[PDB]
Structure 1
Amino acid sequence: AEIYNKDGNKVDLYGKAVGLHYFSKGNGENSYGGNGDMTYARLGFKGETQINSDLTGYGQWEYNFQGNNSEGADAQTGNKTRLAFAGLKYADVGSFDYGRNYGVVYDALGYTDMLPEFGGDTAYSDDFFVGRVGGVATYRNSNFFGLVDGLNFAVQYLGKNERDTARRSNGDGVGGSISYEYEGFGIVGAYGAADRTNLQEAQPLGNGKKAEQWATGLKYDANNIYLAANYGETRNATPITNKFTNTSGFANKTQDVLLVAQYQFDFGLRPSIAYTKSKAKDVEGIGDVDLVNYFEVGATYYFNKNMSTYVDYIINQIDSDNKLGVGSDDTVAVGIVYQF
């Protein structure tokens, strides 16, 4: 909600609370998503200020707090800051921002990540360009300087991050994305490339330096309908863990396919269906294997903008014999949401 809109400056505090639960057979080790109560509340602030008619500056930050944790030493587990960045929007030339934000490839992967709770599994966090990361500088053009309506492009530089874990570390990277929206229809294409750090190469799995991601997305949203299809391929970019070996690293090659079909009703209802798949190739000692392969069937009732309820049933098609100890169990989630 907009709490402060004065002096040519406007502040929008946006926050929500989600009472959530996951069900599944067994304790939930093998469940796709998990099991139990997954309630969490997010708080964030967005701020703008028009310095000049043609130049305005903005800053946004978001944090997520989990409620499933106890009040002991594990209170902070799963608590983090998702987004924290700033930037300025010029009138037509474009806009430039910096901070902790989504990677260009997320722009392409946004079409599939429309599910209530699950979805966007391929778009891992703290990954090169697919998810939200810290240390990015992004430039964006809307409608190509107002030349061509609906066609906008963005470019992003990624400062190297040498962290303790290869899963969370990266190096110098670059990426770009283009999106043409016309009359409701939408097309997008994004590409990102970066260098893997010594820790990443040193990992038992994974080989090579050039970590590459790219994706193409298509969609149509109108008439209370939303269809979407994103196909993305990556090299040495996706993280992978082997429970049998209890060893991690990156995937020499990965193909990911996402498909979504959601309908919406006037009476605050939106049933959803989603197919997903990700196959890794040239895995060290496991050849080619499927990381995730499932169906979605879910729904969301929108009492209003500030109140909603939803359910999602994930038909995990992964088999138990999978060569990475992956969870071969179905799962379901039921959630209730308040948001201001």
Structure 2
Amino acid sequence: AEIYNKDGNKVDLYGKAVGLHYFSKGNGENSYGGNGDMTYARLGFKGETQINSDLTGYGQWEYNFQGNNSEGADAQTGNKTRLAFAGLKYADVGSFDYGRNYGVVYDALGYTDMLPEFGGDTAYSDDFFVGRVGGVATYRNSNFFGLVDGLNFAVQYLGKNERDTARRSNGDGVGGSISYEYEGFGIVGAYGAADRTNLQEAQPLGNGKKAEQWATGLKYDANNIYLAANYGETRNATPITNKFTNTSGFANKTQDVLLVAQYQFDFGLRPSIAYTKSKAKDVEGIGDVDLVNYFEVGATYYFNKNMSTYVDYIINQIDSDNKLGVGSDDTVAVGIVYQF
């Protein structure tokens, strides 16, 4: 919602309130996604200042308030800042923004992150270059300096965050992406690599000097149809956890598949189906092991640009004895979403 536009500065202040609720066998401990209330709300701004003919300056901040907590001891459980960065867009020669922002290998994984509530399984937050991440300087450039329309590249440096948990820490890394979009089709490729911190080196699971993730993607977005594929491999980056030994760490290798197909009906309903399989290879003391594996059928019904409601049902394929303990039961979500 653009709530300010005066003297060459427009301020979009947006947010949502999502009444969410999950359903899984038992108390949902062994399930794919959980059980119970999942209500949340978000609140953010995008700012945008016209400096002059060439320069545009922008800054974005986006936060997640949770609504399934009590007003007591656990009140802030799961509150977080999802994005906060500033940057500069120059005339024809691209854009440069440093802050908390999306990793570059998300440029590929975004292809298959279209599901109503689930999906996007391999785009782990705070995991180097896939999904969001802190301290990233990103240069992006669309239509190749004005010379080749549809062709975009982005290249990004990952500033080291050495935190208290190995899960949420990273060394220095560099990475980039390229995409071509031509008449409804989209090809995309992303690759980044980065040093692992000393604390990540010392984890029972995952071993190696450098982490690297890459992903590629096909898509077809045209004619009320959406098809998308993503394939990607990681070395020493996809976080894992053996719930049997209560160790954690990183997968030594993962081979990831993501497929999406959805159609948008003229009356409002956008049914979707998905398949995901993230296979981990050479996990310490385990070997090969599936981290993710499912078919998803779901639907969002759009009342308009401000109100919507969905059902997302996961058919979980993860086994009863997935050695890392990855949960195997099915999960289904129901949401009503007001967004502004």
For residues 173-208 of structure 1, the C-alpha deviation after alignment (integer angstroms, 9 at most, x for no partner) is 110000000011100000010010110010011111
Counterpart CA distance in 1 for 2:281 and 2:31 is: 24
Counterpart in the other structure of 2:138: 138
Counterpart CA distance in 2 for 1:75 and 1:125 is: 22
Give the total of aligned pairs: 340
Counterpart CA distance in 2 for 1:128 and 1:103 is: 7
For residues 263-316 of structure 1, the C-alpha deviation after alignment (integer angstroms, 9 at most, x for no partner) is 001111100000000011111000111011001000000000000000000000
Q: Could you tell me how far 1:95 is from its partner in structure 2?
A: 1.0
Counterpart CA distance in 2 for 1:224 and 1:124 is: 29
For residues 138-190 of structure 1, the C-alpha deviation after alignment (integer angstroms, 9 at most, x for no partner) is 00111001101000000000001110011000000110000000011100000
Instruction: Give SS of 1:96's match.
Output: strand
Q: Could you tell me how far 1:121 is from its partner in structure 2?
A: 1.1
Q: Could you tell me how far 1:116 is from its partner in structure 2?
A: 1.1
Counterpart CA distance in 2 for 1:251 and 1:325 is: 14
Q: Could you tell me how far 1:252 is from its partner in structure 2?
A: 0.8
Q: Could you tell me how far 1:52 is from its partner in structure 2?
A: 1.0
Q: Could you tell me how far 1:241 is from its partner in structure 2?
A: 0.3
Counterpart CA distance in 2 for 1:75 and 1:34 is: 19
Instruction: Give SS of 2:27's match.
Output: coil
Instruction: Give SS of 1:270's match.
Output: strand
Instruction: Give SS of 2:105's match.
Output: helix
2:24 is aligned with 1:21: no
2:157 is aligned with 1:157: yes
Counterpart CA distance in 2 for 1:263 and 1:324 is: 35
Instruction: Give SS of 1:77's match.
Output: coil
Counterpart CA distance in 2 for 1:54 and 1:38 is: 44
Counterpart CA distance in 2 for 1:195 and 1:254 is: 18
Counterpart CA distance in 2 for 1:269 and 1:326 is: 32
Counterpart CA distance in 2 for 1:328 and 1:339 is: 32
Runs of 4+ in 1 over 6 A off after TM superposition: none
Counterpart in the other structure of 1:122: 122
Q: Could you tell me how far 1:58 is from its partner in structure 2?
A: 0.1
Counterpart CA distance in 1 for 2:33 and 2:317 is: 13
Q: Could you tell me how far 1:131 is from its partner in structure 2?
A: 1.1
Q: Could you tell me how far 1:68 is from its partner in structure 2?
A: 0.6
Counterpart CA distance in 2 for 1:38 and 1:244 is: 26
Counterpart CA distance in 1 for 2:184 and 2:145 is: 20
2:268 is aligned with 1:268: yes
Q: Could you tell me how far 1:88 is from its partner in structure 2?
A: 0.8
Q: Could you tell me how far 1:209 is from its partner in structure 2?
A: 1.1
Counterpart CA distance in 2 for 1:226 and 1:203 is: 40
For residues 107-145 of structure 1, the C-alpha deviation after alignment (integer angstroms, 9 at most, x for no partner) is 110011111110111110000000111100000111001
Q: Could you tell me how far 1:325 is from its partner in structure 2?
A: 1.1
Counterpart CA distance in 2 for 1:325 and 1:94 is: 45
Structure 2 length as normaliser, TM-score? 0.99
Counterpart CA distance in 2 for 1:24 and 1:322 is: 18
Q: Could you tell me how far 1:245 is from its partner in structure 2?
A: 0.4
Counterpart CA distance in 2 for 1:52 and 1:40 is: 39
Counterpart in the other structure of 2:148: 148
Counterpart CA distance in 2 for 1:257 and 1:17 is: 31
Counterpart in the other structure of 1:201: 201
Counterpart CA distance in 2 for 1:26 and 1:143 is: 52
Instruction: Give SS of 1:266's match.
Output: coil
Counterpart CA distance in 2 for 1:250 and 1:42 is: 30
For residues 65-113 of structure 1, the C-alpha deviation after alignment (integer angstroms, 9 at most, x for no partner) is 1111111110000100000001011110111111000001111100111
Q: Could you tell me how far 1:3 is from its partner in structure 2?
A: 0.2
Structure 1 length as normaliser, TM-score? 0.99
Instruction: Give SS of 1:199's match.
Output: helix
Counterpart CA distance in 1 for 2:6 and 2:242 is: 54
Alignment of 1:197-276 (within 5 A): 197-276=197-276
For residues 312-337 of structure 1, the C-alpha deviation after alignment (integer angstroms, 9 at most, x for no partner) is 00000011111111101011000000
Counterpart CA distance in 1 for 2:104 and 2:81 is: 19
Q: Could you tell me how far 1:259 is from its partner in structure 2?
A: 0.2
Q: Could you tell me how far 1:249 is from its partner in structure 2?
A: 0.5
Counterpart CA distance in 2 for 1:283 and 1:192 is: 22
